């Protein structure tokens, strides 16, 4: 069953070095799978939802025929990675948090 495939993708990603977290959030800002506790989850979901719709509106405004498949914000602690796939019937901006300092 493909549920084993997506959970396997979580261990594929999460087996990498330093990867603190993986989470998936849909267009209505509600997380679906987690890896964190519940409140760091909901504050990521709200913040990243608003930020990525602003960034996509920025890129679409800047050029009409160009969209984004990628987003990468930096800390001094952890490099949040956002990926979105803007489509109909699905738009699931998955977001990873990682850093190469650990381990």
């Amino acid at each position: 069953v493909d549920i084993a495939a997506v959970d396997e993708t979580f261990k594929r990603l999460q087996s990498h070095k330093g990867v603190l977290g993986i989470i998936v959030i849909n267009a209505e800002g509600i997380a679906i799978r987690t890896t964190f506790d519940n409140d760091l989850t909901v504050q990521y979901a709200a913040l990243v939802s608003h930020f990525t719709v602003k960034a996509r509106s920025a890129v679409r405004k800047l050029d009409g025929d160009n969209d984004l498949k990628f987003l990468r914000i930096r800390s001094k602690k952890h490099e949040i990675m956002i990926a979105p796939e803007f489509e109909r019937s699905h738009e699931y901006y998955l977001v990873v948090v990682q850093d190469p300092s650990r381990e």
Binding site: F51, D63, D67, K69, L71, I73, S75, K77
Partner: protein
């Protein structure tokens, strides 16, 4: 003579189409473009994204800050180095 030599190196690689420096509020100083109908576009669209992202990062644990940011579109890689004085932009398709 180090800042301008780095500008001249960085503007002559295989994909770079524009380097921009913009101040706190605005005033894009030292662009690199043969016309200026789209510099102002960058200068008034992008630092909203830079400080909005500093809000997103810093909200979590206030010892934290933001340093850089990348947005990779289909045909562009908008890299912004935001900090306290200014915002800096480099545009490049890979």
């Amino acid at each position: 003579s180090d800042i301008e030599s780095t500008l001249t190196r960085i503007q002559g690689h295989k994909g770079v189409i524009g380097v921009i420096i913009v101040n706190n509020q605005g005033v894009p100083l030292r662009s690199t473009f043969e016309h200026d109908a789209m510099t102002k576009q960058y200068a008034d669209l992008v630092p909203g994204l830079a400080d909005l992202a500093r809000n997103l990062v810093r909200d979590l644990d206030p010892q934290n800050d933001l340093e850089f940011l990348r947005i990779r579109s289909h045909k562009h890689e908008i890299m912004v180095a935001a900090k306290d004085d200014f915002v800096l932009l480099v545009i490049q398709d890979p």
